[PDB]
Design a protein around this ligand. Structure first.
Ligand code: 53F
Lengths: 99, 99
């Protein structure tokens, strides 16, 4: 659907068997989720935002259903204040900006 | 225009007589720009992101031209890593998400 920006663009996602709410974030290259348990193996990583850096765990090729659209890609898990769907997955569900 | 997200959605802006590049950021409530000289009077403020918090100067009713669309609103100035156009201004230039 089209989404306007008067409110935070939140969507329901299903990942790792669990249901969550996440922000569609054009200002994020990567997808970053709050602490949650995801099955596979991972690789430590450091990502930088507005207030500095956080350590996250990088999971590759994770299935995510974003507003009922399926995508597979990298998901980062760590102490982000909010679940963020980044451009890496936005492209996969055909998400675009319009003005 | 319609913008895809295979790359960072960067646009050219004009503010305070100066030309800058800024990221269209659906994940940001407010607009935040790197240290620059802005004429107005300002109020101290504190904003939080992924790695913690930064102190910014809040300027109200600042004119901004974003890809040739004019908007007037609050602009925050401080040590952000990148110039961010947030939802407060995105709504004014009629910007939407689409998928
Ligand atoms: C490294 O350079 C940057 C680049 C972009 C950003 C923007 C944020 N996204 C962000 O934190 O992205 C992180 C994690 C996701 O992947 C990466 O994408 C680019 C960036 O390297 C890194 C996001 O879009 C908005 N943020 C908020 C989200 C966490 C919900 S905010 O900037 O902290 C921000 C906070 C309060 C206000 N009022 C205004 C902005 C910040 C700093």
């Amino acid at each position: 659907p089209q989404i306007t920006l008067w409110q935070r663009p939140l969507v329901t996602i299903k990942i790792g068997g669990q249901l969550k709410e996440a922000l569609l974030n054009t200002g994020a290259d990567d997808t970053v989720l709050e602490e949650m348990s995801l099955p596979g193996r991972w690789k430590p990583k450091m990502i930088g935002g507005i207030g500095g850096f956080i350590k996250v765990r990088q999971y590759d090729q994770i299935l995510i259903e974003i507003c009922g659209h399926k995508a597979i890609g990298t998901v980062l898990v760590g102490p982000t204040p909010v679940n963020i769907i980044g451009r890496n997955l936005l492209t996969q569900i055909g998400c675009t900006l319009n003005f």
